[PDB]
Amino acid sequence: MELIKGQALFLELDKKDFLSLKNNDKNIPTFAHPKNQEKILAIFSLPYKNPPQNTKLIAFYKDKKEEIFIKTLEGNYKSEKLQVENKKIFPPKTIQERIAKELKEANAIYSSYTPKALFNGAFNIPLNSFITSDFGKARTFNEKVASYHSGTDFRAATGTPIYAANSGVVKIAKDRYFAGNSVVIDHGFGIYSQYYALSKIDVKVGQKIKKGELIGLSGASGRVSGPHLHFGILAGGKQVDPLDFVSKFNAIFQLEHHHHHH
Ligand SMILES: [Zn+2]
């Protein structure tokens, strides 16, 4: 199999006598295929940054082992040059404790696995065909610093209402240093959706949220300048192309075949 770096893949395996799916030492959790009761699923994701050239997974069954080979593809990522506030790439030493704190909090959330579906059918995606910066765009900040885009940016006037892409539990709902007013929702199965750069936050941590419920208003408080929604997905432990992820998830989990938007 082949997978573009920075993308997720839904792996389908026989359910009968299955024990474990392992990358190297890492256990990859599995969950029931929602339509085919002879199959189970796992989410496998490749990092955008420094991915392996090839991956070998092993599925352990009671009486056999199966090897799954995945070759990393480079894809067709583009690039942009951006001017940002200097503080966003050179934070003063005195604020780096706050950044380190917010990193530890985020890591605790993403390393906590919810072994049940909190979502409800397909993810909604924004009704918006003006992507100002796609996932994985290579970036040069202020002519000298490099990065890559870890989510997808949609042109939106400040104050555009933002609705949860699916049901789940809110895990983050505050201003964070780099990407501003931020909401993160746990959907179960290690799937998290992210909404950054907001001007207003209308949810609170621990709140159960339904698909299509208002979580805030779009803003211009993010790392990059300009009014936009930053939308992200973390799945399989990695930031992945969120529009691509939603397309693959929805093909499996949608309850109706119609168009999925709020
Ligand atoms: Zn962004």
Residue numbers in the entry: 20 to 281
What do the authors report?
We decided to mutate His216 and His247 individually to alanine in order to abrogate the binding of tartrate or citrate at the active site and impair catalysis too. Since crystals of Pgp3 contained one or three subunits in the asymmetric unit of WT and variants (H216A and H247A, both discussed later) depending on the space group, we analyzed the oligomeric states of the WT and variant Pgp3 in solution using size-exclusion chromatography with multi-angle light scattering (SEC-MALS) experiments.
We have described herein the reactions and the structure of Pgp3, a Csd protein of C. jejuni.
